[PDB]
Design a protein around this motif. Structure first.
Motif: not given
Ligand code: HEM
Length: 153
Positions: A96, A92, A42-43, A32, A138, A89
């Motif tokens: 967030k 958040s 994003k992290f 990814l 999903f 899921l």
């Protein structure tokens, strides 16, 4: 709409992922982040990572990779009756972390790429089709909740 035979292929594939989850989660996240450096921003935990080798050496990256595949497996094991697992899921990741559907597509592509790479001659046409449909379900289910939550995605 997956058949019961298609779900049983999904559950079999995912059993192989859970039996070797550290490697699987690590390769999925690395696929990814190298393939889509924008998703790394994003992290907060990982945005400092630049090379693939740094990524392969992060115990934190490996730990979060297992959180991801473990949570995904919980959704897959409910196979179309997964509303209880998708809700926190979507909550958040919409409220967030703010993850657009496009990135959930990227991580699905990555999962399939890792599944092909790690299971030579043991990840055949039926399993690929089944996984592709399960991951499509999903993403769609999440996107529907994204809108109820007022998040574009
Ligand atoms: C199959 C797709 C995914 C699964 C199953 C998954 C699962 C999880 C879970 C279980 C958590 C921890 C609890 C929570 O915050 O809900 C988490 C956290 C998080 N996710 Fe995902 N996730 C997925 C995709 C993504 C993608 C594609 C991104 C792209 C940027 C992302 C960004 C984040 C961030 C930033 C966190 C918090 C990380 C931290 O604690 O530092 N997620 N994810």
């Amino acid at each position: 709409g997956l058949s019961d035979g298609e779900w049983q292929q999904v559950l079999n594939v995912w059993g192989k992922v859970e039996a070797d989850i550290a490697g699987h989660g690590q390769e999925v996240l690395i696929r990814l982040f190298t393939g889509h450096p924008e998703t790394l921003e994003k992290f907060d935990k990982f945005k400092h990572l630049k090379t693939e080798a740094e990524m392969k050496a992060s115990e934190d990256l490996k730990k979060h990779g297992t959180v991801v595949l473990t949570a995904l497996g919980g959704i897959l094991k409910k196979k179309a009756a997964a509303e209880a697992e998708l809700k926190p899921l979507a909550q958040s990741h919409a409220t967030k972390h703010k993850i657009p559907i496009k990135y959930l597509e990227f991580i699905s592509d990555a999962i399939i790429h890792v599944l092909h790479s790690k299971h030579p001659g043991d990840f055949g046409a039926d399993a690929q089709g089944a996984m592709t449909k399960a991951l499509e379900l999903f993403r769609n289910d999440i996107a529907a909740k994204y809108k109820e939550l007022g998040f574009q995605g």
